[PDB]
Amino acid sequence: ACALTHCGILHKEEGRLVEAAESYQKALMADASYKPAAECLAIVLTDLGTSLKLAGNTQEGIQKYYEALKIDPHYAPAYYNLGVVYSEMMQYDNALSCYEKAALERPMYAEAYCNMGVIYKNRGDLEMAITCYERCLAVSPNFEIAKNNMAIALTDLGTKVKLEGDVTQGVAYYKKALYYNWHYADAMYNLGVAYGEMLKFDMAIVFYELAFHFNPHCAEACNNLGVLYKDRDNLDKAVECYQMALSIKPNFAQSLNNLGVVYTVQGKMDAAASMIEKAILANPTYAEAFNNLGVLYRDAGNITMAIDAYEECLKIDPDSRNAGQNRLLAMNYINEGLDDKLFEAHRDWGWRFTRLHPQYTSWDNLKDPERPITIGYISPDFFTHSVSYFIEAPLTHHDYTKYKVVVYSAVVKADAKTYRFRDKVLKKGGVWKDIYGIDEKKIASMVREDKIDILVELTGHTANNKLGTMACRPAPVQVTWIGYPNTTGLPTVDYRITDSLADPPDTKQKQVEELVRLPDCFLCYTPSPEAGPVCPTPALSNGFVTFGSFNNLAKITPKVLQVWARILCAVPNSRLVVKCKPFCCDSIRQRFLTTLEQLGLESKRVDLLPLILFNHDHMQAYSLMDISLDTFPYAGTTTTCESLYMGVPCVTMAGSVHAHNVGVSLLTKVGLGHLVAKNEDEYVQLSVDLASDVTALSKLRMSLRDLMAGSPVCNGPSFAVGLESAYRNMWKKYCK
Amino acid sequence: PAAECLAIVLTDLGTSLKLAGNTQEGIQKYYEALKIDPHYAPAYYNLGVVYSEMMQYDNALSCYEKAALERPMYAEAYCNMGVIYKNRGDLEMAITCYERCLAVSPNFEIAKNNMAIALTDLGTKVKLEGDVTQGVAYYKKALYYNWHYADAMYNLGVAYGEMLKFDMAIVFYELAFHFNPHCAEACNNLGVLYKDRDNLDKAVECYQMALSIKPNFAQSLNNLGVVYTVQGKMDAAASMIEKAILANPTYAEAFNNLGVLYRDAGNITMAIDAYEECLKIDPDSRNAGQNRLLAMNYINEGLDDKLFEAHRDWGWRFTRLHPQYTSWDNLKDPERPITIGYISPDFFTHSVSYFIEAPLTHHDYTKYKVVVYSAVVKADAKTYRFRDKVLKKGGVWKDIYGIDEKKIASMVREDKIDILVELTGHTANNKLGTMACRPAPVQVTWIGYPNTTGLPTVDYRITDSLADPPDTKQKQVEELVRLPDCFLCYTPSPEAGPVCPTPALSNGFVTFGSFNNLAKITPKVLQVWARILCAVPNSRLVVKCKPFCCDSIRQRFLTTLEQLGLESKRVDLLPLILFNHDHMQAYSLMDISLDTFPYAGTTTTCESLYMGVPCVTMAGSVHAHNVGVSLLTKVGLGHLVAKNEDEYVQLSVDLASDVTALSKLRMSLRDLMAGSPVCNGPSFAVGLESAYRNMWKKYCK
């Protein structure tokens, strides 16, 4: 048997398997119990079966493997090959059983463990497959394919666990996946998004960049990265990121929408329109694209089409918060108080939102009417924003020994003014909380944990508002004040602060909040220290009066254009300068000029200026004009204050709604009530009267800065006293 | 407008003159421009550049400061200020200048890169001060502006290694290499991390790469030498460590590793020399001191008091820099469930196991509650068998691998251990530092070391009256407690298999053999074995030592034997056998076991006697020498204990002269031992229990 076995081995080494197999079979006939001849015969039979498999004789291979296992069951590789055959024909139970038996006979044959793991993974049993790979690597820790499959399974498991809400375990699984494969793009991208979701943007960026580096075709990573840079106001990088995403996936609807948004912010209106329309074509059910289209139309002054786009969004997504709030905001630009339809719409939206949220019902605030009071101001606008020019007044002038100030800053990107506010608040003993990216319900929990007395929301239905916090009713008194000129539609909001001129006692505009009228002006402008000097009246050097307006375009309704055309026709050799951010786009400028021409006014006189992002020169630009014409039915607020502070008389119009009467309030309280028109005809008459005299106009210009500084509009202390008294009255009301 | 245009043209003229080498004329034209326009920033930028070129950094700073004041949107000026401050060492002002630069120009790639550099240097500084978390934060901020800044990734790897986040450290070292393949340090650290995970092949790859980048990297040379030592490539390890020593003569750890290699290779004298060099470089090197003591134990006949002096000195100093406890809440009760902790890292298939298993198997739990402190690095079926055996009887098993020593002592205190028994000694991965803390009221050493521990804090050493006779002259430290019977209870494995027929009966020649490790086979034992083999016609010696896997050691030993008068053909050198069964069966290859001196076998002698291979031993004046005397006498073979080399030779010749008697004795030896006190588990358990009780009584008194 020994000689026959060695002859068979020698024949096998030459690959002449047939005679070797015959020799081994003869040896088995000579001495069956010779277990080494049996082992060699099983080996040769398995080699024959493998050759037959590779030759396509799969059934003959099966037969040879069964023969081998009849000769030497212990021969694990025959079980391995049988398992492979069972797997290819999808007999997964037979395959797994064969692999398990092979692993019993040979527990160090890693490749079987890997194949079991792969098969189980294809069946969605990620945990079992992972265990199989783990034991495989316990047998051999360098086997590549097994490391790669372990990384894949770990990433799939981390994603599965994360979608169940355990973000931390998902992150741990992704980190382990990168341990088994440090250049697995999927793991990196998943980590990037998990980190981004948990307010860790720097790491998120690094991860998205790595994911793109290792997998250039991860268009999703480029899109996400562009979004993250956009939120950091690095618009150029966002532009490149989205362009790359579209170079990999031209029809990537998300990149189309996001790039459209970025173009909208930059004022490139035509490009924004084109990209959002492409997004709609790519995904007709992409509601957010409709919302962004509505925003684009609103900024371009096409309010009707903006409302239509928001309505399309709300038919596609009834719960779209952004569409509803932007719709209400857009309606505020054109609906003058005649029909109580806007108020009903706000009420209906508020009832829907109050259904979408369960508020609190009790408060632990000690009901002492005379104790000090904790006032929280909550807003995303504690940066260089219009609202910032007014909230600065109370933050500086509160008596902090009686009204403890808490600031909830949701500012996406701080700046020197945010830091200035925090420094003032902290130096006077106030709490400052940055709450960007924190769930609204967690905001409500925080507000309740901070024991606030009066919560003042300053945003209303504008961008990045926190009305979800207000719906929880975390505080015992909720107020809106300056960010929005109409009712918010929240029954949980108790009061809206105004004055007796913005909302006369006989106002017919219905609102849910009780109006709190301050004795003076409800606004206290804090002038920028960079305002610089007043320039001489241009009329003295140009000989002609230049009217102007630095309001937005959504506020300049066709009717305003008609009235301005009447003004310019009634005053020979006069000019109009209009500065707004979307004039950069040539198409919008052209439509605006054509609209003015249709009213019979020669475009040449009209100077349309785009926006120049520079505070000092932005404020100094009022040296280019002589008389500001306010817009209606949405009066200016900050623009009127800036005009007055520069010495430029500003003519406003009175109407039936708060947004219309804000200009009346400011002008009357600064002492220029003779510049408040009641109707379009008086508006024209007042403008002509101002234009007819230039020396008195120059004296007025030279006096206006000092007049305003001496007025209630700049009397920070008096405003603070009045506002504190109002708050105390609210508190006493609460105690009763 | 004319003044502005003239200033512009004069500045262009000055720049051309500078590029033409007329630097002073350019400076003069720039000053003329600044007289025509004190606000023309480009002139200020030029002045700053030239002032830097002449290394007049203060004027450059002042000029770029006027440039900042005139207009706050000169990104280049802020960048240049940051570079200048970085050059002066100040990183705060540099960071601030770069921050302004990025505040006016965010996408300024140069300013991002320089900000990343400065942030990484600052993180390194802050980390060097102690605050590692802030260092990590600075490195992450660096990876924000330069996500591919390899140095930030490497330094993160370092910090995570210090933080013990080994998986993240691996990832960050691999990324560091990917973004900078010249970072040989990253390669080295990655390999180290992989070695610590018992993945030797990857570690070797990493070190070979580190050396392919930096051939004279001393650290990588040392680490690769160590890895080859673990793999047993003696010559390779030697060469590597020698190169490391040549690259850095103050790399103490390289000397320690060289000493370990020499000791494992049996070259004890030069191993001692290497440890002395290490202790010359670092005097508190725990590893060098303990390896030195262990190595001295292999060749030191009791003819001096230098070994005891060295042990006492080392122990004294060690304890000196070592806080310890001073009070115990252990109830002073002589009739209670005294808690006895056994602490050791070698519970797996190790020589000690074959003896410590006996008490674990036969120990009255209802009186001496046993707690096990297993510091095993890698467990196995035998570890699990021991854990199960202890547990099913009510013992407490605690795995303590990878826990700080002081925390081990604290845990022992919370565990209310009464008698703490250290079973390791001056070997490797010992916990003698825990013993120095004296966490338990009684400290005992028994089987892990054959000589004094030198620590005064250890109270007792377990022995018998044969290994350490009452009149022994060896001065030690601990109090000798002599058990009545053999201090050892061997429990044979269930893999010993049958005793086979006598070799001398079938092969026609007597074969001597030894399974002791090579470190114990001192030349003085080779000469004696050569005399034995010359005295016995047609004799064969079989030696199986690990280091023989390397052919160099085999050749050297064969040459040494040939120089002594023994034909190398007459010498059978066997390497390590992979499996237990056949390794144990290898006792069929010899007729007589030869014990070594001045360090006898312990486990090997018991194995030789269990397989039927009569053993000849030598008496001496040290425990390690007399262990063989203890075993043979207690088995009943005291007539096989020589008193001198001449008696050793005579006994070996006599045993070889009567093949018949040898065969009979071997056929009887297994049952003789099974009936002997060596295999009388109950009697040993009773003796050890009585000894513990006596120790406790002494303590309470």
From Swiss-Prot, chain A:
TPR repeats: 2-34, 42-75, 76-109, 110-143, 151-184, 185-218, 219-252, 254-286, 287-320
A GO MF term: protein O-acetylglucosaminyltransferase activity
Annotated catalysed reactions: L-seryl-[protein] + UDP-N-acetyl-alpha-D-glucosamine = 3-O-(N-acetyl-beta-D-glucosaminyl)-L-seryl-[protein] + UDP + H(+); L-threonyl-[protein] + UDP-N-acetyl-alpha-D-glucosamine = 3-O-(N-acetyl-beta-D-glucosaminyl)-L-threonyl-[protein] + UDP + H(+); L-seryl-[protein] + GDP-beta-L-fucose = 3-O-(alpha-L-fucosyl)-L-seryl-[protein] + GDP + H(+); L-threonyl-[protein] + GDP-beta-L-fucose = 3-O-(alpha-L-fucosyl)-L-threonyl-[protein] + GDP + H(+)
EC number in record: 2.4.1.255, 2.4.1.221
Domain of life: Eukaryota
Reported tissue expression: Widely expressed. Present throughout the plant (at protein level).
Knocked-out gene: effects: Altered root epidermis morphology and root hair patterning.
Subcellular location: Cytoplasm; Nucleus
Subunit structure: Homomultimer; via its TPR repeats. Interacts with GI. Interacts with TCP14 and TCP15. Interacts (via N-terminus) with APRR5. Interacts with CPN20.
Assigned protein family: Belongs to the glycosyltransferase 41 family. O-GlcNAc transferase subfamily.
Record protein name field: Probable UDP-N-acetylglucosamine--peptide N-acetylglucosaminyltransferase SPINDLY
Originating species: Arabidopsis thaliana (Mouse-ear cress)
Range within the parent protein: 111 to 846 of 914
Swiss-Prot record, chain B:
Transferase keyword on record: yes
Region annotated Catalytic region, chain positions: 286-701
Gene name of the encoded protein: SPY
Cellular component annotations (GO), alphabetically ordered: cytoplasm; nucleus
Reactions that this protein is recorded to catalyse: L-seryl-[protein] + UDP-N-acetyl-alpha-D-glucosamine = 3-O-(N-acetyl-beta-D-glucosaminyl)-L-seryl-[protein] + UDP + H(+); L-threonyl-[protein] + UDP-N-acetyl-alpha-D-glucosamine = 3-O-(N-acetyl-beta-D-glucosaminyl)-L-threonyl-[protein] + UDP + H(+); L-seryl-[protein] + GDP-beta-L-fucose = 3-O-(alpha-L-fucosyl)-L-seryl-[protein] + GDP + H(+); L-threonyl-[protein] + GDP-beta-L-fucose = 3-O-(alpha-L-fucosyl)-L-threonyl-[protein] + GDP + H(+)
EC number: 2.4.1.255, 2.4.1.221
Keywords from the UniProt entry: Biological rhythms, Cytoplasm, Developmental protein, Differentiation, Flowering, Gibberellin signaling pathway, Glycosyltransferase, Nucleus, Phosphoprotein, Repeat, TPR repeat, Transferase
Name of the protein described by the UniProt record: Probable UDP-N-acetylglucosamine--peptide N-acetylglucosaminyltransferase SPINDLY
